[PDB]
Design a protein around this ligand. Structure first.
Ligand SMILES: *[C@@H]1O[C@H](CO)[C@@H](O)[C@H](O)[C@H]1NC(C)=O
Lengths: 50, 32
């Protein structure tokens, strides 16, 4: 403002923020157990055993 | 079998600006 005495003044501020976050987690587990046992009382020592 | 994976990502930013515009002029010889 000025009146004919002058007084001067001026201000201008600017602020800005930019935040970011990201997370990723992946798990994969597999377990398999297979057992096959055959008891044969056929009567063959070697050939029956095979 | 076992398998696991993990990912993470983070970004941060912060701006700032501060103007200042002030002028003085006076004239009622005298001048300012
Ligand atoms: C100055 O003022 C302008 C307009 O109001 C604004 O966009 C800017 O962020 C300010 N600061 C600067 C240019 O540093």
């Amino acid at each position: 403002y000025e009146d004919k005495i002058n007084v001067g003044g001026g201000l201008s501020g600017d602020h800005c923020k930019k935040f970011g976050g990201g997370k990723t987690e992946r798990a994969r587990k597999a377990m398999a157990v297979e057992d096959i046992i055959s008891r044969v009382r056929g009567g063959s020592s070697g050939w029956s055993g095979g | 079998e076992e398998q696991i994976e993990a990912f993470k990502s983070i970004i941060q930013e912060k701006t700032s600006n501060f103007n200042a515009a002030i002028s003085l002029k006076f004239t009622p010889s005298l001048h300012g």
